[PDB]
Amino acid sequence: LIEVEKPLYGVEVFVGETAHFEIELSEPDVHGQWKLKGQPLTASPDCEIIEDGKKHILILHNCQLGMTGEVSFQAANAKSAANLKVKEL
């Protein structure tokens, strides 16, 4: 049973830029999963999730307009929720 020493942070992006979401836990050895408003997509060509356990870092690139929601991370018993909005050019 761990918690979230550092929650996420709402960030803006101009479709194409790169969003950033960090969050520290309490115990290493684990694997959560980020999800927009609440949709578990799948790290692909437009998703760059790099986490080494004891730490979790997200890196979304050219984010579309849909991403207009909140980044709620899920892991063991921790749960964060930042704000993210995709603005057009």
Tab-separated table of N, CA and C in Angstrom:
chain	number	residue	atom	x	y	z
A	1	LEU	N	0.853	-1.222	0.000
A	1	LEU	CA	0.000	0.000	0.000
A	1	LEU	C	0.876	1.255	0.000
A	2	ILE	N	0.907	1.971	-1.090
A	2	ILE	CA	1.742	3.205	-1.149
A	2	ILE	C	0.870	4.415	-1.491
A	3	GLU	N	1.467	5.568	-1.624
A	3	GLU	CA	0.673	6.784	-1.956
A	3	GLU	C	1.345	7.565	-3.089
A	4	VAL	N	1.001	8.813	-3.244
A	4	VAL	CA	1.617	9.629	-4.330
A	4	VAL	C	2.297	10.869	-3.739
A	5	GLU	N	3.560	10.770	-3.420
A	5	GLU	CA	4.278	11.943	-2.837
A	5	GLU	C	4.169	13.150	-3.769
A	6	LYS	N	4.164	12.919	-5.052
A	6	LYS	CA	4.067	14.054	-6.012
A	6	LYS	C	2.980	13.776	-7.053
A	7	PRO	N	1.947	14.570	-7.000
A	7	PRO	CA	0.818	14.418	-7.949
A	7	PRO	C	1.228	14.890	-9.346
A	8	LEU	N	0.311	14.891	-10.275
A	8	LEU	CA	0.650	15.336	-11.655
A	8	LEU	C	0.507	16.857	-11.775
A	9	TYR	N	0.562	17.376	-12.971
A	9	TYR	CA	0.433	18.852	-13.153
A	9	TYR	C	-0.270	19.166	-14.477
A	10	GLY	N	-1.299	19.967	-14.439
A	10	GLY	CA	-2.022	20.311	-15.697
A	10	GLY	C	-1.091	21.101	-16.619
A	11	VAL	N	-0.951	20.677	-17.845
A	11	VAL	CA	-0.053	21.406	-18.787
A	11	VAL	C	-0.759	21.638	-20.126
A	12	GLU	N	-0.401	22.685	-20.820
A	12	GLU	CA	-1.049	22.965	-22.133
A	12	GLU	C	-0.107	22.588	-23.280
A	13	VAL	N	-0.637	22.412	-24.460
A	13	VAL	CA	0.229	22.042	-25.618
A	13	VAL	C	-0.437	22.457	-26.932
A	14	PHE	N	0.342	22.835	-27.910
A	14	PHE	CA	-0.248	23.251	-29.216
A	14	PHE	C	-0.202	22.087	-30.212
A	15	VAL	N	-1.061	21.117	-30.047
A	15	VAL	CA	-1.061	19.955	-30.984
A	15	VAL	C	0.302	19.831	-31.670
A	16	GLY	N	1.079	18.852	-31.293
A	16	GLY	CA	2.417	18.678	-31.926
A	16	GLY	C	3.510	18.816	-30.866
A	17	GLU	N	3.346	19.723	-29.941
A	17	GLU	CA	4.380	19.902	-28.882
A	17	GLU	C	4.558	18.602	-28.091
A	18	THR	N	4.883	18.703	-26.834
A	18	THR	CA	5.072	17.474	-26.010
A	18	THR	C	4.641	17.735	-24.564
A	19	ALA	N	3.640	17.037	-24.097
A	19	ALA	CA	3.172	17.247	-22.697
A	19	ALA	C	4.082	16.496	-21.722
A	20	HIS	N	4.048	16.846	-20.467
A	20	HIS	CA	4.918	16.148	-19.476
A	20	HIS	C	4.146	15.871	-18.182
A	21	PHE	N	4.217	14.666	-17.686
A	21	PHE	CA	3.493	14.331	-16.426
A	21	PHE	C	4.393	13.497	-15.509
A	22	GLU	N	4.724	14.012	-14.356
A	22	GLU	CA	5.605	13.248	-13.424
A	22	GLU	C	4.835	12.843	-12.163
A	23	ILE	N	5.311	11.848	-11.466
A	23	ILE	CA	4.618	11.398	-10.224
A	23	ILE	C	5.497	10.404	-9.463
A	24	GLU	N	5.862	10.725	-8.251
A	24	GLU	CA	6.722	9.797	-7.461
A	24	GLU	C	5.866	8.951	-6.513
A	25	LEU	N	6.227	7.714	-6.319
A	25	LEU	CA	5.436	6.839	-5.406
A	25	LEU	C	6.188	6.640	-4.085
A	26	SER	N	6.059	5.489	-3.487
A	26	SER	CA	6.765	5.237	-2.198
A	26	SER	C	7.619	3.972	-2.299
A	27	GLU	N	7.153	2.988	-3.016
A	27	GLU	CA	7.934	1.726	-3.147
A	27	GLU	C	8.193	1.411	-4.623
A	28	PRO	N	9.406	1.016	-4.903
A	28	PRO	CA	9.794	0.678	-6.293
A	28	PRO	C	9.184	-0.664	-6.708
A	29	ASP	N	9.536	-1.154	-7.864
A	29	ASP	CA	8.975	-2.457	-8.322
A	29	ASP	C	7.468	-2.328	-8.559
A	30	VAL	N	7.075	-1.926	-9.737
A	30	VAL	CA	5.620	-1.779	-10.031
A	30	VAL	C	5.416	-1.331	-11.481
A	31	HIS	N	4.190	-1.167	-11.893
A	31	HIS	CA	3.926	-0.728	-13.294
A	31	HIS	C	2.484	-0.231	-13.421
A	32	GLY	N	2.277	1.052	-13.298
A	32	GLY	CA	0.894	1.595	-13.410
A	32	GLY	C	0.569	1.860	-14.879
A	33	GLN	N	-0.391	2.703	-15.142
A	33	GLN	CA	-0.756	3.002	-16.556
A	33	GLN	C	-1.489	4.343	-16.640
A	34	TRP	N	-1.022	5.230	-17.476
A	34	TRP	CA	-1.694	6.555	-17.604
A	34	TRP	C	-2.933	6.434	-18.494
A	35	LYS	N	-3.857	7.349	-18.372
A	35	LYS	CA	-5.087	7.283	-19.212
A	35	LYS	C	-5.755	8.659	-19.284
A	36	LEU	N	-6.030	9.137	-20.467
A	36	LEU	CA	-6.680	10.473	-20.603
A	36	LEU	C	-7.968	10.517	-19.778
A	37	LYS	N	-8.833	11.455	-20.055
A	37	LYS	CA	-10.105	11.544	-19.281
A	37	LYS	C	-10.359	10.227	-18.543
A	38	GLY	N	-9.880	9.136	-19.078
A	38	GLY	CA	-10.092	7.823	-18.408
A	38	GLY	C	-10.076	6.706	-19.453
A	39	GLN	N	-9.282	6.852	-20.479
A	39	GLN	CA	-9.218	5.797	-21.533
A	39	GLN	C	-7.805	5.208	-21.603
A	40	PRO	N	-7.701	3.953	-21.250
A	40	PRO	CA	-6.389	3.261	-21.275
A	40	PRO	C	-5.965	2.974	-22.716
A	41	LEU	N	-5.297	3.899	-23.343
A	41	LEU	CA	-4.857	3.677	-24.748
A	41	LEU	C	-3.750	2.620	-24.789
A	42	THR	N	-2.658	2.914	-25.439
A	42	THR	CA	-1.542	1.928	-25.511
A	42	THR	C	-0.280	2.602	-26.057
A	43	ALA	N	0.724	2.750	-25.237
A	43	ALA	CA	1.982	3.401	-25.703
A	43	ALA	C	2.284	2.997	-27.148
A	44	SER	N	2.154	3.914	-28.066
A	44	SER	CA	2.437	3.586	-29.491
A	44	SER	C	3.390	4.623	-30.088
A	45	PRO	N	3.157	4.938	-31.333
A	45	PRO	CA	4.000	5.933	-32.036
A	45	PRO	C	3.684	7.342	-31.528
A	46	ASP	N	2.514	7.536	-30.984
A	46	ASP	CA	2.146	8.884	-30.467
A	46	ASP	C	2.168	8.885	-28.936
A	47	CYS	N	2.613	7.811	-28.340
A	47	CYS	CA	2.662	7.749	-26.851
A	47	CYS	C	4.068	7.359	-26.388
A	48	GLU	N	4.673	8.161	-25.557
A	48	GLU	CA	6.045	7.835	-25.074
A	48	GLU	C	6.053	7.693	-23.549
A	49	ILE	N	5.780	6.515	-23.054
A	49	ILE	CA	5.769	6.308	-21.575
A	49	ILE	C	7.088	5.681	-21.117
A	50	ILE	N	7.855	6.395	-20.340
A	50	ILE	CA	9.151	5.838	-19.856
A	50	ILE	C	9.187	5.853	-18.326
A	51	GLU	N	9.006	4.718	-17.708
A	51	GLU	CA	9.028	4.672	-16.216
A	51	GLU	C	10.020	3.611	-15.732
A	52	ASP	N	10.830	3.941	-14.761
A	52	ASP	CA	11.815	2.949	-14.244
A	52	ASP	C	11.373	2.434	-12.870
A	53	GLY	N	10.095	2.462	-12.599
A	53	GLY	CA	9.596	1.970	-11.283
A	53	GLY	C	9.669	3.090	-10.248
A	54	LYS	N	10.531	2.945	-9.286
A	54	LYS	CA	10.667	3.990	-8.232
A	54	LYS	C	10.238	5.353	-8.782
A	55	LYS	N	10.058	5.451	-10.071
A	55	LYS	CA	9.644	6.753	-10.669
A	55	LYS	C	8.771	6.523	-11.906
A	56	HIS	N	7.939	7.473	-12.236
A	56	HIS	CA	7.062	7.321	-13.434
A	56	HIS	C	7.028	8.634	-14.221
A	57	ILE	N	7.410	8.603	-15.471
A	57	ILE	CA	7.404	9.854	-16.281
A	57	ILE	C	6.663	9.636	-17.603
A	58	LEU	N	5.786	10.536	-17.956
A	58	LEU	CA	5.034	10.388	-19.236
A	58	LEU	C	5.495	11.450	-20.237
A	59	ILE	N	5.377	11.176	-21.506
A	59	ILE	CA	5.814	12.175	-22.525
A	59	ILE	C	4.932	12.081	-23.774
A	60	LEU	N	3.821	12.765	-23.779
A	60	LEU	CA	2.921	12.715	-24.966
A	60	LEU	C	3.367	13.741	-26.011
A	61	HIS	N	3.407	13.354	-27.256
A	61	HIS	CA	3.837	14.304	-28.320
A	61	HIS	C	2.616	14.918	-29.016
A	62	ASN	N	2.817	15.538	-30.149
A	62	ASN	CA	1.675	16.165	-30.877
A	62	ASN	C	0.341	15.661	-30.321
A	63	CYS	N	-0.091	16.205	-29.216
A	63	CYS	CA	-1.387	15.764	-28.623
A	63	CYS	C	-2.557	16.358	-29.413
A	64	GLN	N	-3.539	15.559	-29.723
A	64	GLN	CA	-4.700	16.061	-30.497
A	64	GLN	C	-5.630	16.896	-29.621
A	65	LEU	N	-6.758	17.278	-30.154
A	65	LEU	CA	-7.723	18.097	-29.372
A	65	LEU	C	-8.472	17.212	-28.371
A	66	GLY	N	-8.719	15.978	-28.726
A	66	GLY	CA	-9.441	15.063	-27.796
A	66	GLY	C	-8.735	15.061	-26.440
A	67	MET	N	-7.450	14.836	-26.435
A	67	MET	CA	-6.701	14.823	-25.151
A	67	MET	C	-7.265	15.882	-24.198
A	68	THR	N	-8.267	16.605	-24.623
A	68	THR	CA	-8.860	17.651	-23.740
A	68	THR	C	-9.516	17.001	-22.519
A	69	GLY	N	-8.739	16.643	-21.534
A	69	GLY	CA	-9.324	16.005	-20.322
A	69	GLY	C	-8.330	16.093	-19.162
A	70	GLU	N	-8.221	15.051	-18.384
A	70	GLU	CA	-7.268	15.072	-17.237
A	70	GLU	C	-6.384	13.824	-17.267
A	71	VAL	N	-5.155	13.948	-16.851
A	71	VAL	CA	-4.243	12.770	-16.855
A	71	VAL	C	-4.321	12.039	-15.512
A	72	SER	N	-5.152	11.038	-15.421
A	72	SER	CA	-5.276	10.288	-14.138
A	72	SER	C	-4.401	9.034	-14.173
A	73	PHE	N	-3.350	9.012	-13.400
A	73	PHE	CA	-2.457	7.818	-13.387
A	73	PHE	C	-2.990	6.775	-12.400
A	74	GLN	N	-2.720	5.522	-12.642
A	74	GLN	CA	-3.212	4.461	-11.717
A	74	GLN	C	-2.081	3.487	-11.377
A	75	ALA	N	-1.900	3.189	-10.120
A	75	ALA	CA	-0.814	2.245	-9.729
A	75	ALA	C	-1.077	1.685	-8.329
A	76	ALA	N	-0.975	0.393	-8.170
A	76	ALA	CA	-1.216	-0.218	-6.830
A	76	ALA	C	-2.389	0.476	-6.132
A	77	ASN	N	-2.104	1.375	-5.228
A	77	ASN	CA	-3.204	2.082	-4.508
A	77	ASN	C	-3.080	3.596	-4.698
A	78	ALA	N	-2.114	4.034	-5.459
A	78	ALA	CA	-1.947	5.499	-5.679
A	78	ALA	C	-2.852	5.964	-6.825
A	79	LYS	N	-3.169	7.229	-6.870
A	79	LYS	CA	-4.049	7.739	-7.962
A	79	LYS	C	-3.884	9.253	-8.113
A	80	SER	N	-3.329	9.692	-9.208
A	80	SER	CA	-3.143	11.157	-9.416
A	80	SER	C	-4.131	11.667	-10.470
A	81	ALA	N	-4.187	12.955	-10.671
A	81	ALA	CA	-5.132	13.509	-11.683
A	81	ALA	C	-4.775	14.963	-12.006
A	82	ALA	N	-4.103	15.189	-13.102
A	82	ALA	CA	-3.723	16.584	-13.471
A	82	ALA	C	-4.686	17.133	-14.526
A	83	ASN	N	-4.419	18.307	-15.029
A	83	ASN	CA	-5.316	18.898	-16.063
A	83	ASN	C	-4.554	19.075	-17.380
A	84	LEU	N	-5.134	18.663	-18.474
A	84	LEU	CA	-4.437	18.808	-19.783
A	84	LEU	C	-5.420	19.263	-20.864
A	85	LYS	N	-5.060	20.265	-21.618
A	85	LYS	CA	-5.972	20.752	-22.693
A	85	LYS	C	-5.201	20.901	-24.007
A	86	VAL	N	-5.722	20.365	-25.074
A	86	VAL	CA	-5.019	20.474	-26.384
A	86	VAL	C	-5.578	21.656	-27.183
A	87	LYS	N	-4.788	22.677	-27.378
A	87	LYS	CA	-5.275	23.860	-28.145
A	87	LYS	C	-4.810	23.776	-29.602
A	88	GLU	N	-5.620	24.229	-30.519
A	88	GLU	CA	-5.225	24.175	-31.956
A	88	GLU	C	-4.310	25.354	-32.299
A	89	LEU	N	-3.868	25.436	-33.525
A	89	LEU	CA	-2.972	26.561	-33.924
A	89	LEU	C	-3.804	27.792	-34.297
